[PDB]
Coordinates of C-alpha atoms in Angstrom, one line a residue:
Chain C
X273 CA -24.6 13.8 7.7
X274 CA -21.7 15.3 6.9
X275 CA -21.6 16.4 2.8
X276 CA -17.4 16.6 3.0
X277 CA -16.8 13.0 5.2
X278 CA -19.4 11.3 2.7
X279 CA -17.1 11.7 0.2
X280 CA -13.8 11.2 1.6
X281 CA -15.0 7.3 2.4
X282 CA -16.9 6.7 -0.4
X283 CA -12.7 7.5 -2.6
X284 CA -11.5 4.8 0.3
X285 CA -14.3 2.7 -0.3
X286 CA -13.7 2.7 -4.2
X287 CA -10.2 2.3 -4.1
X288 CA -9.9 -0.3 -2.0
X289 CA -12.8 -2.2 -3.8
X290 CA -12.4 -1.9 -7.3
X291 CA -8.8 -3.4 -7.2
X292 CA -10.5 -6.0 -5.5
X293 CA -13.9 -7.0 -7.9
X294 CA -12.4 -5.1 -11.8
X295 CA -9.8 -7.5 -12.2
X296 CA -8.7 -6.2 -15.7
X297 CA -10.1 -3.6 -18.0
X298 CA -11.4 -5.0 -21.8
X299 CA -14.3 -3.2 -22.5
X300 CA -15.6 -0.2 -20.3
X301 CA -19.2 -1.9 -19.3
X302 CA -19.1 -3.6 -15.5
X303 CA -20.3 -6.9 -15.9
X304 CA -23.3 -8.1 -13.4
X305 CA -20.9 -10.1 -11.7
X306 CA -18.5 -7.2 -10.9
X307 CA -21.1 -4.5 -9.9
X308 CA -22.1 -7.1 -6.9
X309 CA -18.8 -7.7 -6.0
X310 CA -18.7 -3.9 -6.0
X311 CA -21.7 -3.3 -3.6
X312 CA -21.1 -6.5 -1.8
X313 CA -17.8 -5.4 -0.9
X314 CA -18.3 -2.0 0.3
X315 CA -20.9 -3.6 3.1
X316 CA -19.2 -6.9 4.0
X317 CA -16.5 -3.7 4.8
X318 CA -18.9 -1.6 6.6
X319 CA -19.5 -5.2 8.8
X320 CA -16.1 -5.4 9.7
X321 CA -15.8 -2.1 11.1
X322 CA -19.1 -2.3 13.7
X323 CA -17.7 -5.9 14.2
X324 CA -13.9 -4.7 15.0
X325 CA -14.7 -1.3 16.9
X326 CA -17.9 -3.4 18.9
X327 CA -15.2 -6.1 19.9
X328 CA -12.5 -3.5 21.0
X329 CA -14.8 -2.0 23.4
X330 CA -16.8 -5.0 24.8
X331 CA -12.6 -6.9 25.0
Chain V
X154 CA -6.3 5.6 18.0
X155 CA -8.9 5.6 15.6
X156 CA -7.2 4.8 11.9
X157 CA -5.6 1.7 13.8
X158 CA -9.6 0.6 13.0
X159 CA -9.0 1.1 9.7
X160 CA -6.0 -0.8 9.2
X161 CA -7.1 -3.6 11.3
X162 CA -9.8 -3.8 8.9
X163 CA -8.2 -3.6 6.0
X164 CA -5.8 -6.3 7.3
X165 CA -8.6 -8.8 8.2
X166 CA -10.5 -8.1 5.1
X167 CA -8.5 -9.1 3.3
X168 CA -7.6 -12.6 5.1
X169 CA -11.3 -13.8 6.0
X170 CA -13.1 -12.8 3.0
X171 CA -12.7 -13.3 -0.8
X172 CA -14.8 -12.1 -4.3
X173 CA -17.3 -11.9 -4.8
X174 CA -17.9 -10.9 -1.0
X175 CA -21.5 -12.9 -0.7
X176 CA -21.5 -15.0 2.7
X177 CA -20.2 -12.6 5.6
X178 CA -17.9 -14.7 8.1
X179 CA -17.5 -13.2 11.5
X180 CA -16.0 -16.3 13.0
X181 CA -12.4 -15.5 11.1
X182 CA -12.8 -11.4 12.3
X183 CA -13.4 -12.1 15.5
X184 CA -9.6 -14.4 15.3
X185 CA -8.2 -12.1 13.0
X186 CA -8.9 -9.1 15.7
X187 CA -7.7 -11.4 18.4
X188 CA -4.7 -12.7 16.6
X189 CA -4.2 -8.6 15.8
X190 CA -3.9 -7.1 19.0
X191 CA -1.1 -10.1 19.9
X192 CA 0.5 -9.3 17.6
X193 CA 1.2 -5.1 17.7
X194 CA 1.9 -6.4 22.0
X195 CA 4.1 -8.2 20.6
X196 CA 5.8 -5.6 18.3
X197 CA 4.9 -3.3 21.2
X198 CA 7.0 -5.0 23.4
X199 CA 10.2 -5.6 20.6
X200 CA 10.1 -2.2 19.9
X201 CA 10.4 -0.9 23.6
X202 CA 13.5 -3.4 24.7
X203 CA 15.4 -2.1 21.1
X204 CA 15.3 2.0 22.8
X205 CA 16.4 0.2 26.0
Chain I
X246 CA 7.4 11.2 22.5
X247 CA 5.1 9.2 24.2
X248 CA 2.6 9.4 20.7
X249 CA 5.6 8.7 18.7
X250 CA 5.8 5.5 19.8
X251 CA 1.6 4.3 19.1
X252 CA 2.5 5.8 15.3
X253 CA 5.4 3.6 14.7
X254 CA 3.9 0.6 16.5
X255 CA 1.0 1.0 14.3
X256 CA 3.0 0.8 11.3
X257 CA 5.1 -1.7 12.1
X258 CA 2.3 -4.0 12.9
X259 CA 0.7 -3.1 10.2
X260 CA 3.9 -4.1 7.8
X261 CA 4.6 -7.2 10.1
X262 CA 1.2 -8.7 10.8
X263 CA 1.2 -9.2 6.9
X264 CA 4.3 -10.9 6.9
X265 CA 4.4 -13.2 9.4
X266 CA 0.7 -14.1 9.7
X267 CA 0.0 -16.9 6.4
X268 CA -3.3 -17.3 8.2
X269 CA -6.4 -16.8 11.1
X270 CA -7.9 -20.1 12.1
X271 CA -7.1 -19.8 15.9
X272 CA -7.4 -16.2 17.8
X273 CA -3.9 -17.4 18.9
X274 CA -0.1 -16.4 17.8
X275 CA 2.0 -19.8 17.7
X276 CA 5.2 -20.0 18.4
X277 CA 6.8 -19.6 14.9
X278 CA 4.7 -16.4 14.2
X279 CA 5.4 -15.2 17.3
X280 CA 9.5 -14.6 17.0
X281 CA 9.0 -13.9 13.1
X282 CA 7.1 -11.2 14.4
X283 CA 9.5 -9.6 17.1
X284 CA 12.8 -11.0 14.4
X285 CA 10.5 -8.7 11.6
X286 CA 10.3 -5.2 14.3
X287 CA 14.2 -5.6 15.1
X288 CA 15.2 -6.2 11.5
X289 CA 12.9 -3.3 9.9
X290 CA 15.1 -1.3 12.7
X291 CA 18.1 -2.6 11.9
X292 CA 17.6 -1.4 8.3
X293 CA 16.7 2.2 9.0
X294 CA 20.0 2.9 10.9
X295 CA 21.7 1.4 7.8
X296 CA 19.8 3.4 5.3
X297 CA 20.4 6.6 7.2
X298 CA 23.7 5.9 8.0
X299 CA 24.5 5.4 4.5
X300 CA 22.7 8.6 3.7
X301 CA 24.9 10.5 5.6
X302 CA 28.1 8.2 4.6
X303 CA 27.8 8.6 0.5
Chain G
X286 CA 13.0 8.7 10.4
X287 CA 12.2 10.7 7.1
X288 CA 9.5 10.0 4.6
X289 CA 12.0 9.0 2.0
X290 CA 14.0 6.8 4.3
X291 CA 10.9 5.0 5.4
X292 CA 10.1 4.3 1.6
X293 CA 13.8 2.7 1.1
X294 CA 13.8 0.9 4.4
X295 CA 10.8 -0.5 3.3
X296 CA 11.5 -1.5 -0.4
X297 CA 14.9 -2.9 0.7
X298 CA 13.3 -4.4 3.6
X299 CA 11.1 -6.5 1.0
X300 CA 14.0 -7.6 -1.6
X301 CA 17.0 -8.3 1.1
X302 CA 14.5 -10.2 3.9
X303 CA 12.6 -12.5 4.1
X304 CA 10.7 -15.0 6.8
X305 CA 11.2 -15.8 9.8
X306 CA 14.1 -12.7 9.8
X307 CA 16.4 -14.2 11.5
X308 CA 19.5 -13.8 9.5
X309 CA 20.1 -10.2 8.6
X310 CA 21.9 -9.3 5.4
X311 CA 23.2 -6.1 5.4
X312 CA 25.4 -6.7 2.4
X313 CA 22.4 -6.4 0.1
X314 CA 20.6 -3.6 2.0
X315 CA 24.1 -1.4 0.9
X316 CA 23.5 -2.2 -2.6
X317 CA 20.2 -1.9 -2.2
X318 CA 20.4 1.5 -1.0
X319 CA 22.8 2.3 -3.6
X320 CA 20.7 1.1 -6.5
X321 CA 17.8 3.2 -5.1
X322 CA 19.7 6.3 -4.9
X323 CA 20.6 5.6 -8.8
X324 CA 17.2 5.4 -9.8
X325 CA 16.0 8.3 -7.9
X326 CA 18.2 10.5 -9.9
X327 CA 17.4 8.4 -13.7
X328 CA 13.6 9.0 -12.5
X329 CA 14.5 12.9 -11.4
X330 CA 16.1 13.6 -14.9
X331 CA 13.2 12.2 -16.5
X332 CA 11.0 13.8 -15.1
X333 CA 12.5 17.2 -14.7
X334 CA 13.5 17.1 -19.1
X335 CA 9.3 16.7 -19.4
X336 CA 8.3 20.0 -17.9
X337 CA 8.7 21.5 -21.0
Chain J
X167 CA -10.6 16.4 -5.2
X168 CA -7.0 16.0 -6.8
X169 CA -6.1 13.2 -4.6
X170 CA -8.6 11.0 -6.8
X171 CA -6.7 11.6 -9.9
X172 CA -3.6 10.0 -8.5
X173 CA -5.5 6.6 -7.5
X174 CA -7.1 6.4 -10.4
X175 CA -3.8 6.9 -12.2
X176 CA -2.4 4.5 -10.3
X177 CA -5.3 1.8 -10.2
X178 CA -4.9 2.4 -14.3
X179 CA -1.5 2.2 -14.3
X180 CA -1.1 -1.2 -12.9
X181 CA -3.8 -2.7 -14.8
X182 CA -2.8 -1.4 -18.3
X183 CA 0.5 -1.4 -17.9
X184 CA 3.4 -3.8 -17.4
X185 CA 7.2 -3.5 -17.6
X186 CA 9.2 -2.6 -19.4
X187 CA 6.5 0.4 -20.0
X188 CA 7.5 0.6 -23.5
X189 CA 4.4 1.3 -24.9
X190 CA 1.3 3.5 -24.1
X191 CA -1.5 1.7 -23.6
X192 CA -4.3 4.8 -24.0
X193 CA -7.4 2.5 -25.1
X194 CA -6.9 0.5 -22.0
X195 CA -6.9 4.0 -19.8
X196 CA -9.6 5.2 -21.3
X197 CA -11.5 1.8 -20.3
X198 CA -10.0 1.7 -17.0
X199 CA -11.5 5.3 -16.1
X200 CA -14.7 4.8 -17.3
X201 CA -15.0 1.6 -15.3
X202 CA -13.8 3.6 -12.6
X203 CA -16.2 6.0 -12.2
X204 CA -19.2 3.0 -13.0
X205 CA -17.6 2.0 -9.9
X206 CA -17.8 4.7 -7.6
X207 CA -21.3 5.6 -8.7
X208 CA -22.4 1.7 -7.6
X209 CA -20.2 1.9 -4.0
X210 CA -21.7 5.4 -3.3
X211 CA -25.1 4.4 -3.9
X212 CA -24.5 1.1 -1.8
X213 CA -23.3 3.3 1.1
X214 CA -25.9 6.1 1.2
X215 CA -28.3 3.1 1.4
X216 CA -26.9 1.9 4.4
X217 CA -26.6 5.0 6.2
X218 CA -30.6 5.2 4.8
Chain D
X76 CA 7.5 23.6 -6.9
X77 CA 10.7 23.4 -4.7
X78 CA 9.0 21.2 -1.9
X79 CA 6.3 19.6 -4.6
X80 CA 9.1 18.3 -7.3
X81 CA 11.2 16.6 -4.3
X82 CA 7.2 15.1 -3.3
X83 CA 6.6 13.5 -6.8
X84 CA 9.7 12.5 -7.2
X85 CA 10.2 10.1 -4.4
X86 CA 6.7 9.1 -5.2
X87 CA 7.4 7.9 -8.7
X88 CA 10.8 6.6 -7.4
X89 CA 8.7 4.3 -4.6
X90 CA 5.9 3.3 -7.6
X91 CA 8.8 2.7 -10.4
X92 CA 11.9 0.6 -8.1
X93 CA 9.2 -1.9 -7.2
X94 CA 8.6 -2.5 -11.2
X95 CA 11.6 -2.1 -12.1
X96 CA 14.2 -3.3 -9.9
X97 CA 13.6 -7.2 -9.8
X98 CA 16.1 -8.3 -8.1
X99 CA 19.7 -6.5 -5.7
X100 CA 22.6 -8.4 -6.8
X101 CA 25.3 -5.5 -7.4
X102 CA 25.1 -1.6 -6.6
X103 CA 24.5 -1.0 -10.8
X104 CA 21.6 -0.2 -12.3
X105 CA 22.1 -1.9 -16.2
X106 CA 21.1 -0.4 -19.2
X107 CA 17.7 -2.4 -19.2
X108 CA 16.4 -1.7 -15.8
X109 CA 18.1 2.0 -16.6
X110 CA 15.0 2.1 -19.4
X111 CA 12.5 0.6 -17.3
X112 CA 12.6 3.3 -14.9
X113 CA 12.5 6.0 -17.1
X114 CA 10.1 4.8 -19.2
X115 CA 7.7 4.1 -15.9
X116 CA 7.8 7.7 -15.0
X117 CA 7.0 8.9 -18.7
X118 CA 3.8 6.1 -19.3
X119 CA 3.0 7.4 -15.5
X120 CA 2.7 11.0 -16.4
X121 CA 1.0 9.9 -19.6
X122 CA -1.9 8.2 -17.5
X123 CA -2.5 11.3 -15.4
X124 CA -2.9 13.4 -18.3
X125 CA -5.2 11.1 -19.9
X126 CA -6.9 10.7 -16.9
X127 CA -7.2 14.4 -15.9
X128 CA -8.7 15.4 -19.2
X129 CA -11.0 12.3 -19.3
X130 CA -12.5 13.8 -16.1

């Protein structure tokens, strides 16, 4: 791996994501539903990239 | 070459898919990709004929 | 400034493709997208030389 | 272009234009401009008078 | 390692937050972080998964 | 400092116009929106506090 890039995504990753699946802030506990957005989220990402970077060799 | 990835992903992310993120839809990607590079020719091309 | 021109492009598209694209069902541009799209480059333009131009006027 | 003009052309871009972009309007994008030239400085005082 | 501070700060800032700005909102910050770092423990630990 | 004021500033000016500035209509700022900005950069600064000694 590499210690420094495994970070760097994962502050992407979060960014991008929690805006998406905390819609607002009333008590500080993430509900079930939110932490599977959460996880959810970061790997329906992950698809998209193989997906994108796969098609832009293959076309 | 290699953020444009990135931003393409962001960009169909957010079009194709919606919380809670459950069913994966690769259909809409593949389109949204398509439609994507079409579009920065397009821009490409606008751009280039405006520094004539 | 032959990479100058991928960096802008980029980020035009980027800024563009999210303003004239409502939508992906085909892998096609129609024709309403399509001049919304080169209109949205040429206008972003546009405003830059005004900006600066003001800049320097102030 | 600078990183500052980017970030005007940009905001303006968004509050004096709209789709398809046809019909420019650079009466606004003057004001525009002007306005954010105004707040840079209300948002520079501000800022500066908290630095103890 | 600084750079997180200013999206958390900013993720914060438009969830607790809404013009005019006239009052702080600090029990809704404090929240917000907390949540925010919840969150970034689940997404890492959904990523080094993947990468098993 | 010399470089690094100029940086944060036309970041908070870019974050605050967007909230503040609803709508162009003259080349005045009013007294409301005038409040709105500085207020913004203030409850900004605020949050990174907050937020840095959280951490």
């Amino acid at each position: 791996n590499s210690k420094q890039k495994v970070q760097m995504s994962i502050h992407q990753f979060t960014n991008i994501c929690f805006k998406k699946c905390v819609e607002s802030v009333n008590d500080s506990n993430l509900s079930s539903q939110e932490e599977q957005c959460l996880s959810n989220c970061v790997n329906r990402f992950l698809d998209t990239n193989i997906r994108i970077v796969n098609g832009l060799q293959n076309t | 070459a290699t953020e444009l990835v990135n931003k393409i992903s962001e960009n169909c992310f957010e079009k194709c898919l919606t919380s809670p993120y459950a069913t994966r839809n690769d259909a809409c990607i593949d389109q949204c990709l398509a439609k994507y590079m079409r579009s920065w020719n397009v821009i490409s091309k606008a751009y280039i004929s405006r520094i004539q």
